[PDB]
Coordinates of C-alpha atoms and ligand atoms in Angstrom, one line a residue:
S1 CA -70.1 78.5 331.8
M2 CA -70.7 75.4 329.8
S3 CA -73.9 75.4 327.7
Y4 CA -74.6 71.8 328.7
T5 CA -73.2 69.1 331.0
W6 CA -74.0 65.5 330.2
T7 CA -74.4 62.3 332.3
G8 CA -73.9 59.9 329.4
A9 CA -77.5 58.8 329.2
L10 CA -78.5 58.8 325.5
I11 CA -81.1 61.1 323.9
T12 CA -83.8 58.5 323.1
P13 CA -86.6 58.3 320.5
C14 CA -90.2 58.2 321.7
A15 CA -91.3 56.1 318.7
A16 CA -90.0 54.5 315.5
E17 CA -87.7 56.7 313.4
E18 CA -87.3 56.7 309.6
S19 CA -84.2 58.1 308.0
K20 CA -84.6 56.8 304.4
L21 CA -87.1 58.6 302.1
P22 CA -90.3 56.5 302.1
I23 CA -91.5 55.6 298.6
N24 CA -95.0 55.0 297.2
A25 CA -96.6 55.1 293.7
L26 CA -96.5 58.9 293.7
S27 CA -92.9 59.5 294.6
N28 CA -91.3 59.2 291.1
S29 CA -93.6 61.7 289.6
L30 CA -91.9 64.3 291.9
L31 CA -88.4 63.1 292.6
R32 CA -86.2 60.3 291.3
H33 CA -83.0 60.7 293.3
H34 CA -84.4 59.1 296.5
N35 CA -81.0 58.5 298.1
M36 CA -80.4 62.2 298.3
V37 CA -83.3 62.7 300.7
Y38 CA -83.1 61.7 304.4
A39 CA -84.5 62.5 307.8
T40 CA -82.5 63.2 310.9
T41 CA -82.9 60.8 313.9
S42 CA -81.7 60.3 317.4
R43 CA -78.9 58.2 316.0
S44 CA -77.0 61.4 315.3
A45 CA -78.0 63.2 318.6
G46 CA -74.5 62.5 319.8
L47 CA -72.9 64.5 317.0
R48 CA -75.3 67.4 317.8
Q49 CA -74.5 67.2 321.5
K50 CA -70.8 67.8 320.7
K51 CA -71.6 70.9 318.5
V52 CA -73.9 72.7 320.9
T53 CA -71.7 71.9 324.0
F54 CA -69.2 74.7 324.7
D55 CA -68.0 77.3 327.1
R56 CA -69.5 80.8 326.9
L57 CA -67.7 84.0 328.0
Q58 CA -69.1 87.5 327.9
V59 CA -67.6 90.9 328.0
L60 CA -70.3 93.6 328.3
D61 CA -69.3 97.2 327.5
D62 CA -71.1 100.5 327.5
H63 CA -72.6 100.1 324.0
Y64 CA -74.3 97.0 325.3
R65 CA -75.8 98.8 328.4
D66 CA -76.8 101.9 326.3
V67 CA -78.8 99.8 323.9
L68 CA -80.3 97.7 326.7
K69 CA -81.4 100.9 328.6
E70 CA -83.1 102.1 325.4
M71 CA -84.9 98.8 324.9
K72 CA -86.1 98.9 328.5
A73 CA -87.4 102.4 328.0
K74 CA -89.6 101.2 325.1
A75 CA -90.6 98.1 327.0
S76 CA -91.9 100.3 329.8
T77 CA -94.7 101.6 327.5
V78 CA -96.1 98.1 327.1
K79 CA -99.1 97.0 329.1
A80 CA -99.6 93.3 328.9
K81 CA -102.5 91.2 330.3
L82 CA -102.6 87.7 331.9
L83 CA -104.5 85.1 329.9
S84 CA -107.2 83.1 331.7
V85 CA -106.8 79.3 331.9
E86 CA -109.4 78.9 329.1
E87 CA -107.7 81.2 326.7
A88 CA -104.3 79.6 327.3
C89 CA -105.9 76.2 326.8
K90 CA -107.4 77.2 323.4
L91 CA -104.0 78.2 322.2
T92 CA -102.8 74.6 322.7
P93 CA -102.2 72.5 319.6
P94 CA -104.6 69.5 319.4
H95 CA -101.6 67.2 319.0
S96 CA -99.2 68.8 321.5
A97 CA -97.3 66.3 323.6
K98 CA -99.4 65.0 326.5
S99 CA -98.7 65.8 330.1
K100 CA -96.9 63.3 332.4
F101 CA -99.7 63.9 334.8
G102 CA -102.7 62.0 333.3
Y103 CA -104.1 64.2 330.5
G104 CA -103.4 65.4 327.0
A105 CA -103.8 68.3 324.6
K106 CA -107.4 67.5 323.9
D107 CA -108.3 67.4 327.5
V108 CA -106.7 70.8 327.8
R109 CA -108.6 72.2 324.8
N110 CA -111.8 70.7 326.1
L111 CA -111.1 72.3 329.5
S112 CA -111.4 69.0 331.3
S113 CA -111.6 69.3 335.1
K114 CA -108.5 67.1 335.5
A115 CA -106.3 69.2 333.1
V116 CA -107.6 72.5 334.4
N117 CA -107.1 71.4 338.0
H118 CA -103.5 70.3 337.4
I119 CA -102.8 73.5 335.4
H120 CA -104.0 75.6 338.4
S121 CA -101.8 73.6 340.7
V122 CA -98.8 74.2 338.5
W123 CA -99.7 78.0 338.4
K124 CA -99.9 78.1 342.2
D125 CA -96.6 76.3 342.5
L126 CA -94.9 78.9 340.2
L127 CA -96.2 81.7 342.5
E128 CA -95.0 79.9 345.7
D129 CA -91.7 78.6 344.4
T130 CA -89.2 80.7 342.4
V131 CA -86.2 78.5 342.9
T132 CA -86.7 74.8 342.1
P133 CA -85.5 73.9 338.6
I134 CA -88.4 72.7 336.4
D135 CA -88.0 69.4 334.5
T136 CA -87.7 69.3 330.8
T137 CA -87.6 66.6 328.1
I138 CA -84.9 66.5 325.5
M139 CA -85.6 64.9 322.1
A140 CA -83.9 64.6 318.7
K141 CA -86.0 66.3 316.0
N142 CA -86.9 64.4 312.9
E143 CA -86.4 66.8 310.0
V144 CA -86.0 66.1 306.2
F145 CA -83.1 67.5 304.1
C146 CA -81.2 66.8 300.9
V147 CA -77.6 65.4 301.2
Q148 CA -74.3 66.8 299.8
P149 CA -72.0 68.4 299.4
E150 CA -69.1 68.8 301.9
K151 CA -70.9 69.4 305.2
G152 CA -70.4 65.8 306.2
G153 CA -73.0 64.6 303.8
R154 CA -75.7 64.6 306.4
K155 CA -76.4 67.0 309.3
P156 CA -77.1 65.8 312.9
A157 CA -80.6 66.0 314.3
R158 CA -81.4 69.3 316.0
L159 CA -82.4 69.1 319.6
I160 CA -85.7 70.2 321.3
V161 CA -86.0 70.9 325.0
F162 CA -89.5 71.4 326.5
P163 CA -91.3 71.5 329.8
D164 CA -94.5 69.5 330.7
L165 CA -97.8 70.4 329.1
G166 CA -99.1 71.9 332.4
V167 CA -96.2 74.3 332.5
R168 CA -96.6 75.2 328.8
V169 CA -100.2 76.3 329.5
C170 CA -98.9 78.4 332.4
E171 CA -96.3 80.1 330.2
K172 CA -99.1 81.2 327.9
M173 CA -101.1 82.7 330.8
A174 CA -98.1 84.7 332.1
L175 CA -96.4 85.5 328.8
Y176 CA -98.4 85.0 325.7
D177 CA -99.6 88.6 325.5
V178 CA -96.1 89.8 326.4
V179 CA -94.2 87.8 323.7
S180 CA -96.9 88.8 321.2
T181 CA -96.7 92.6 321.7
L182 CA -93.4 93.5 323.4
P183 CA -91.0 92.7 320.5
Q184 CA -92.6 95.1 318.0
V185 CA -92.7 97.9 320.6
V186 CA -89.1 97.5 321.5
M187 CA -87.6 96.9 318.0
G188 CA -90.1 98.8 315.8
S189 CA -89.6 98.0 312.1
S190 CA -86.7 95.8 312.9
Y191 CA -88.9 93.1 314.3
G192 CA -89.3 90.7 311.4
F193 CA -92.2 88.5 312.6
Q194 CA -94.6 91.4 312.1
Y195 CA -94.3 91.1 308.3
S196 CA -96.0 88.9 305.8
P197 CA -93.7 87.8 302.9
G198 CA -94.7 90.8 300.8
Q199 CA -94.3 93.2 303.6
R200 CA -90.8 91.8 304.4
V201 CA -89.8 92.3 300.8
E202 CA -91.1 95.8 300.9
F203 CA -89.2 96.7 304.0
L204 CA -86.0 95.2 302.6
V205 CA -86.4 97.0 299.3
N206 CA -87.3 100.3 300.8
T207 CA -84.5 100.1 303.4
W208 CA -82.0 99.3 300.6
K209 CA -83.2 102.3 298.6
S210 CA -83.0 104.6 301.6
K211 CA -79.2 104.3 301.6
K212 CA -77.0 106.4 299.3
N213 CA -74.6 103.5 298.6
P214 CA -76.3 100.4 300.2
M215 CA -74.3 97.6 301.7
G216 CA -75.8 94.6 303.5
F217 CA -74.9 91.4 305.2
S218 CA -76.5 88.5 307.1
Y219 CA -74.9 87.5 310.3
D220 CA -74.9 83.8 311.1
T221 CA -74.3 83.0 314.8
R222 CA -73.0 79.5 315.4
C223 CA -75.6 77.6 317.4
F224 CA -77.3 80.7 318.7
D225 CA -79.4 78.9 321.4
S226 CA -76.2 77.6 323.0
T227 CA -74.6 81.0 323.0
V228 CA -77.4 82.4 325.1
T229 CA -76.1 82.7 328.7
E230 CA -77.7 83.1 332.1
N231 CA -77.0 86.8 331.9
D232 CA -78.8 87.0 328.6
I233 CA -81.8 85.2 330.0
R234 CA -81.9 87.4 333.1
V235 CA -81.6 90.5 331.0
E236 CA -84.5 89.3 329.0
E237 CA -86.5 89.0 332.2
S238 CA -85.6 92.5 333.2
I239 CA -87.1 93.7 329.9
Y240 CA -90.3 91.8 330.4
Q241 CA -90.6 93.2 333.9
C242 CA -90.5 96.7 332.4
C243 CA -94.0 96.1 331.1
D244 CA -97.1 97.2 333.0
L245 CA -98.1 93.8 334.4
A246 CA -100.4 92.3 337.0
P247 CA -98.4 91.4 340.2
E248 CA -99.3 87.7 339.7
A249 CA -97.8 87.8 336.2
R250 CA -94.6 89.4 337.5
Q251 CA -94.2 86.6 340.0
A252 CA -94.9 83.9 337.4
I253 CA -92.4 85.4 334.9
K254 CA -89.7 85.7 337.6
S255 CA -90.5 82.1 338.6
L256 CA -90.4 80.8 335.0
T257 CA -87.1 82.6 334.4
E258 CA -85.4 81.2 337.5
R259 CA -86.7 77.7 337.3
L260 CA -87.0 77.1 333.5
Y261 CA -85.6 79.7 331.2
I262 CA -82.1 80.1 332.7
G263 CA -81.6 76.3 332.7
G264 CA -82.6 73.0 334.3
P265 CA -82.3 69.2 334.2
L266 CA -82.7 67.3 331.0
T267 CA -84.6 64.1 330.8
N268 CA -84.9 61.7 327.9
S269 CA -88.0 60.0 326.7
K270 CA -87.2 57.0 328.9
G271 CA -87.1 59.1 332.1
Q272 CA -83.4 59.1 332.5
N273 CA -81.4 62.2 333.5
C274 CA -79.3 63.3 330.5
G275 CA -77.6 66.3 332.0
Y276 CA -78.1 69.9 332.7
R277 CA -78.8 73.0 330.5
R278 CA -77.4 76.5 331.1
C279 CA -78.5 78.0 327.8
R280 CA -81.7 78.8 325.8
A281 CA -84.3 76.0 325.9
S282 CA -85.6 75.5 322.3
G283 CA -89.1 74.5 323.3
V284 CA -90.4 77.3 325.5
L285 CA -92.9 80.1 324.8
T286 CA -90.2 82.7 325.1
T287 CA -87.7 81.1 322.8
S288 CA -88.6 83.3 319.8
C289 CA -89.0 86.6 321.7
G290 CA -86.0 85.9 323.8
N291 CA -83.7 85.1 320.8
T292 CA -85.0 88.1 318.9
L293 CA -84.5 90.6 321.8
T294 CA -81.0 89.2 322.6
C295 CA -79.9 89.0 319.0
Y296 CA -81.2 92.6 318.5
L297 CA -79.5 93.8 321.7
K298 CA -76.1 92.3 320.8
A299 CA -76.2 93.3 317.2
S300 CA -77.4 96.9 317.8
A301 CA -74.5 97.4 320.3
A302 CA -72.1 95.7 317.9
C303 CA -73.2 98.1 315.1
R304 CA -72.2 100.9 317.4
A305 CA -68.8 99.4 318.2
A306 CA -68.2 98.9 314.5
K307 CA -69.4 102.5 313.7
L308 CA -71.6 101.3 310.9
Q309 CA -73.4 104.1 309.1
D310 CA -77.1 104.6 309.1
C311 CA -77.8 101.0 310.2
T312 CA -81.1 99.2 309.7
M313 CA -81.5 95.7 311.1
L314 CA -84.1 93.0 310.5
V315 CA -84.3 90.4 313.2
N316 CA -86.2 87.1 313.3
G317 CA -85.0 85.2 316.4
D318 CA -81.4 84.3 315.7
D319 CA -81.7 85.3 312.0
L320 CA -80.1 88.7 311.5
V321 CA -79.6 90.9 308.4
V322 CA -78.2 94.5 308.4
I323 CA -78.4 97.1 305.7
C324 CA -76.3 100.2 306.0
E325 CA -74.6 103.1 304.3
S326 CA -71.5 101.8 302.5
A327 CA -68.2 103.6 303.3
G328 CA -66.2 101.9 300.6
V329 CA -65.6 98.2 300.0
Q330 CA -62.4 98.4 302.0
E331 CA -63.9 100.0 305.2
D332 CA -66.9 97.7 304.8
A333 CA -64.9 94.6 305.2
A334 CA -63.1 96.1 308.2
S335 CA -66.3 97.3 309.8
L336 CA -67.8 93.8 309.5
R337 CA -64.7 92.4 311.2
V338 CA -65.2 94.8 314.1
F339 CA -68.9 94.0 314.2
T340 CA -68.0 90.3 314.3
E341 CA -65.4 90.8 317.1
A342 CA -68.1 92.7 319.1
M343 CA -70.7 90.0 318.6
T344 CA -68.1 87.5 319.7
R345 CA -67.3 89.3 322.9
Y346 CA -71.0 89.2 323.6
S347 CA -70.9 85.4 323.2
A348 CA -72.3 85.2 319.7
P349 CA -69.4 84.0 317.5
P350 CA -70.2 83.5 313.8
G351 CA -70.7 80.2 311.9
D352 CA -70.1 81.4 308.4
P353 CA -68.0 84.6 308.4
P354 CA -70.2 87.6 307.3
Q355 CA -69.4 89.2 304.0
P356 CA -70.6 92.6 302.5
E357 CA -73.2 92.4 299.8
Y358 CA -73.8 95.2 297.3
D359 CA -76.7 93.4 295.5
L360 CA -79.8 93.1 297.5
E361 CA -80.8 90.0 295.6
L362 CA -77.7 88.2 296.8
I363 CA -78.5 88.6 300.5
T364 CA -80.1 85.6 302.1
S365 CA -82.0 86.1 305.4
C366 CA -84.5 83.7 306.9
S367 CA -83.3 81.3 304.2
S368 CA -84.8 83.6 301.6
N369 CA -83.7 86.3 299.1
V370 CA -85.5 89.1 297.2
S371 CA -85.9 88.5 293.5
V372 CA -87.8 90.2 290.6
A373 CA -90.5 89.2 288.1
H374 CA -93.2 91.0 286.2
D375 CA -96.9 91.4 286.6
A376 CA -99.6 91.4 283.9
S377 CA -98.9 95.0 283.1
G378 CA -95.3 94.2 282.6
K379 CA -94.1 96.1 285.7
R380 CA -91.1 94.9 287.7
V381 CA -92.3 93.1 290.8
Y382 CA -90.1 92.2 293.9
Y383 CA -91.0 89.0 295.7
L384 CA -89.5 86.6 298.2
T385 CA -88.1 83.3 297.1
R386 CA -85.4 80.7 298.2
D387 CA -83.5 77.7 297.0
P388 CA -86.2 75.0 296.6
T389 CA -84.0 72.0 297.6
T390 CA -85.2 71.6 301.1
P391 CA -88.8 72.5 300.3
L392 CA -88.7 69.8 297.5
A393 CA -87.0 67.2 299.6
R394 CA -89.7 67.7 302.3
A395 CA -92.5 67.6 299.7
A396 CA -91.1 64.2 298.5
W397 CA -91.3 62.9 302.1
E398 CA -94.9 64.2 302.6
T399 CA -95.9 62.7 299.2
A400 CA -95.5 59.2 300.8
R401 CA -95.9 59.9 304.5
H402 CA -98.5 61.8 306.4
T403 CA -96.8 64.2 308.8
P404 CA -97.9 66.4 311.7
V405 CA -96.7 69.5 309.8
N406 CA -97.3 69.8 306.1
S407 CA -94.3 71.8 304.9
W408 CA -95.6 71.8 301.3
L409 CA -98.7 73.8 302.4
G410 CA -96.7 76.3 304.4
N411 CA -94.4 76.8 301.5
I412 CA -97.2 77.3 299.0
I413 CA -98.7 80.0 301.3
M414 CA -95.4 81.8 302.0
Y415 CA -93.8 81.4 298.6
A416 CA -96.9 81.5 296.5
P417 CA -95.4 84.1 294.0
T418 CA -92.4 81.9 293.2
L419 CA -91.8 79.9 290.1
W420 CA -91.2 76.6 291.9
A421 CA -94.1 76.8 294.4
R422 CA -96.5 77.6 291.5
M423 CA -95.3 75.1 288.9
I424 CA -94.3 72.2 291.2
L425 CA -95.8 72.3 294.7
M426 CA -99.3 73.5 293.6
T427 CA -99.5 71.2 290.6
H428 CA -98.2 68.1 292.5
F429 CA -100.2 68.4 295.7
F430 CA -103.5 69.5 294.1
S431 CA -103.2 66.5 291.8
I432 CA -102.9 64.3 294.9
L433 CA -105.7 66.0 296.7
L434 CA -108.0 65.7 293.7
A435 CA -107.4 62.0 293.3
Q436 CA -108.2 61.4 297.0
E437 CA -111.1 63.9 297.2
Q438 CA -109.4 65.6 300.1
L439 CA -109.5 69.2 298.9
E440 CA -111.8 70.1 301.8
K441 CA -109.7 68.4 304.4
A442 CA -108.1 70.8 306.8
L443 CA -104.3 70.3 307.1
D444 CA -101.9 71.7 309.7
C445 CA -98.9 73.7 308.8
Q446 CA -96.7 76.2 310.7
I447 CA -96.1 79.9 310.0
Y448 CA -93.6 81.7 312.2
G449 CA -93.6 78.8 314.6
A450 CA -97.4 78.9 315.1
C451 CA -99.7 76.1 314.1
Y452 CA -102.7 76.7 311.7
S453 CA -105.3 74.3 310.4
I454 CA -105.9 75.2 306.8
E455 CA -108.3 73.9 304.1
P456 CA -106.5 73.7 300.7
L457 CA -109.6 75.0 298.9
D458 CA -109.0 78.3 300.7
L459 CA -105.6 78.9 299.2
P460 CA -106.8 81.3 296.5
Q461 CA -108.2 83.7 299.1
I462 CA -105.3 83.3 301.5
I463 CA -102.8 84.0 298.8
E464 CA -104.8 87.0 297.5
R465 CA -104.9 88.4 301.0
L466 CA -101.2 87.9 301.7
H467 CA -99.6 88.5 298.3
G468 CA -102.3 90.2 296.3
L469 CA -103.7 89.2 292.9
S470 CA -100.2 89.7 291.3
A471 CA -99.2 86.3 292.8
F472 CA -101.5 84.7 290.2
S473 CA -99.9 86.4 287.2
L474 CA -96.2 87.0 287.7
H475 CA -94.1 86.0 284.7
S476 CA -90.6 86.5 283.2
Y477 CA -88.6 85.5 286.3
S478 CA -84.9 86.4 286.5
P479 CA -82.4 84.2 284.8
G480 CA -80.7 83.7 288.1
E481 CA -83.8 82.4 289.7
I482 CA -84.8 80.2 286.8
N483 CA -81.3 78.7 286.7
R484 CA -81.3 78.0 290.4
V485 CA -84.6 76.2 290.2
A486 CA -83.7 74.3 287.1
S487 CA -80.4 73.3 288.7
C488 CA -82.1 72.1 291.8
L489 CA -84.5 69.9 289.8
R490 CA -81.6 68.2 288.0
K491 CA -79.9 67.6 291.3
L492 CA -82.9 65.9 292.9
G493 CA -84.1 64.2 289.8
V494 CA -87.3 66.3 289.6
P495 CA -89.0 66.5 286.2
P496 CA -88.1 69.8 284.3
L497 CA -90.5 72.8 284.5
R498 CA -91.9 72.0 281.0
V499 CA -93.2 68.8 282.4
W500 CA -94.9 70.6 285.3
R501 CA -96.5 73.1 282.9
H502 CA -98.0 70.2 281.0
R503 CA -99.3 68.6 284.2
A504 CA -100.7 71.9 285.5
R505 CA -103.1 72.2 282.5
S506 CA -104.5 68.8 283.5
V507 CA -104.8 69.6 287.2
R508 CA -106.3 72.9 286.2
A509 CA -108.9 71.2 284.0
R510 CA -109.7 68.7 286.7
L511 CA -110.3 71.5 289.3
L512 CA -112.6 73.5 286.9
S513 CA -114.6 70.3 286.4
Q514 CA -115.4 70.2 290.1
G515 CA -116.9 73.7 290.2
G516 CA -117.3 75.6 293.5
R517 CA -114.1 76.3 295.5
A518 CA -112.3 73.7 293.5
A519 CA -113.0 75.6 290.3
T520 CA -111.7 78.8 291.9
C521 CA -108.4 77.0 292.7
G522 CA -108.0 75.9 289.1
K523 CA -108.8 79.3 287.8
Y524 CA -106.5 81.4 290.0
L525 CA -103.7 79.0 291.0
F526 CA -103.1 77.7 287.5
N527 CA -103.9 80.6 285.1
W528 CA -100.2 80.6 284.4
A529 CA -100.5 77.2 282.7
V530 CA -102.9 78.2 279.9
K531 CA -101.7 80.3 276.9
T532 CA -104.9 82.4 276.9
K533 CA -105.1 83.6 280.5
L534 CA -108.2 85.1 282.2
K535 CA -108.8 88.3 284.1
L536 CA -108.7 87.0 287.7
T537 CA -110.7 89.5 289.8
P538 CA -110.8 89.9 293.6
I539 CA -112.3 87.0 295.5
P540 CA -115.3 87.9 297.7
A541 CA -114.3 85.4 300.4
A542 CA -110.8 86.9 300.5
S543 CA -111.9 90.0 302.4
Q544 CA -114.0 87.7 304.6
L545 CA -110.9 85.8 305.8
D546 CA -109.8 86.5 309.3
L547 CA -106.0 86.7 308.9
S548 CA -105.5 88.2 312.3
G549 CA -102.5 87.0 314.3
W550 CA -100.9 85.5 311.2
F551 CA -98.0 87.8 311.1
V552 CA -97.7 89.5 314.5
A553 CA -95.0 87.5 316.3
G554 CA -92.8 84.4 316.2
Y555 CA -93.6 81.4 318.3
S556 CA -91.0 78.8 317.3
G557 CA -91.1 76.0 319.8
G558 CA -93.7 77.9 321.7
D559 CA -96.4 75.3 321.3
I560 CA -98.9 77.8 319.8
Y561 CA -102.1 77.0 317.9
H562 CA -103.8 79.9 316.0
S563 CA -107.0 78.3 314.6
Ligands
LIG1 C1 -89.3 85.3 306.2 C2 -90.5 84.6 305.6 C3 -91.4 85.6 304.9 C4 -90.0 83.5 304.5 C5 -89.3 82.2 305.1 N1 -90.0 81.5 306.2 C6 -89.6 81.7 307.5 O1 -88.7 82.5 307.8 C7 -90.2 80.9 308.7 C8 -89.8 81.1 310.1 N2 -90.5 80.7 311.2 S1 -89.9 80.5 312.6 O2 -90.7 81.1 313.6 O3 -89.6 79.1 312.8 C9 -88.3 81.3 312.6 C10 -87.6 81.5 313.8 C11 -86.3 82.2 313.8 C12 -85.8 82.6 312.5 C13 -86.6 82.4 311.4 C14 -87.8 81.8 311.4 N3 -88.5 81.6 310.3 C15 -91.2 80.0 308.4 O4 -91.9 79.2 309.4 C16 -91.6 79.7 307.0 C17 -92.6 78.8 306.7 C18 -93.0 78.5 305.4 C19 -92.4 79.2 304.3 C20 -91.5 80.2 304.6 C21 -91.0 80.5 305.9

């Protein structure tokens, strides 16, 4: 079965597309090597089409069926509810793509009669029709990256496939509660989206320590979405159906599976038929849950086929990392080969071949790695970090261009304890916010696929709640981390850390001068910049924050708003 079939109609833009890094008066203070930063556009959609287009074959053995039966057994304990039209509407992002039927995201959120009436008609159609393929729009994503080295210089735009707004609201009603609760029940501690950064680090560290002679590896599946077959998607449906559901929800899920999830026609922004899809749609509510369940199912069975010892997996959609009991460096390499052969038979061939790791800090999963620093008391502290190249390239772009998603904010929140997020991102962006008097302006960012509207002034409390106060006093980072950051800066032409420490003292002083929440930011976020630090005590508002739903499930491409 081919993942896609094309007509020849091009994947078209729905607006003007920029590829070169936009420059303004603030750009050079952050990055000088402008030519190293770019954004993907529809101009490379052709290259992407070739990569994601291929034949899929599956050979399912008993290990596969054994694991699936166990997953279904846990899924049977789940009771999920249907969401009312209003609840589904409120989960819709204010700037979600408008419907082709006379209404947009705001009309949905406002529960306008027109939107609500059309939504009900789509719902009724799903119940009456369980066969007609539902239309979807295919677009080229505009994402920012840094060039080099030998991966062709620049990577092609990724593709996004999504159904109409009316259908998206319907998915929420029938499956929001399911995709939010089922994964954790089925996979337990292996479900990665239930963890905050600190909790993820804790699980990785404790899992690593639970093995006599730990060995670990990340498994990179080549174009995971395209490796997902009709079988996989139907098996996913069988798992959802194991839940205790309202009869109406069962019909809608069966309908969505047959008409949308398994595949359907692809239409470009101009209304032309681009082809047909027979693999995972990247822009549906079940994309994250489906990829997670399927990755976990195939990997769990593969672990058995490979006979890995005391296996512990951590799955986030298509991102997989396994930690197990080492049986010698020789058998470890052989085991991974068997694991890989098993995954392949299941249709999930690897991109980069997997390799055994015997140093937890060298394993990258979800683009991150565990590292260590020290708190005020001098105690060793494990935290999550990553190479800052992409985060910095995106920050440069957002420095001169307002975007729907502010990656710099998401990165500060998730990587608040890191050297680079603290010295560069915080310093740079708070400087910009100060100068524009926009510290109180709520900005959107995405965490685990979901959209959140966050006020920068609330960062101190948010960071305390997610990482603890230690995020404001970590010091003495590892040489490896320091060197990776410093190297990254030289590559992009970003001023050295010493410059940022100097700038931070200024930003800090400026914030303190504003008093109120602004002062709190200067105090907590930049205490690392002064030689004579302070005490930094718990923030009252911190415990007042409603951080519910922040780290429960993944919703990548799920069109979810959690504010
Ligand atoms: C594992 C995290 C603690 C650290 C890395 N990290 C992520 O993995 C993700 C993330 N969200 S997602 O649903 O698209 C997704 C889908 C499938 C596999 C991984 C992710 N990963 C972030 O959206 C993110 C945003 C800001 C900063 C860091 C971040």
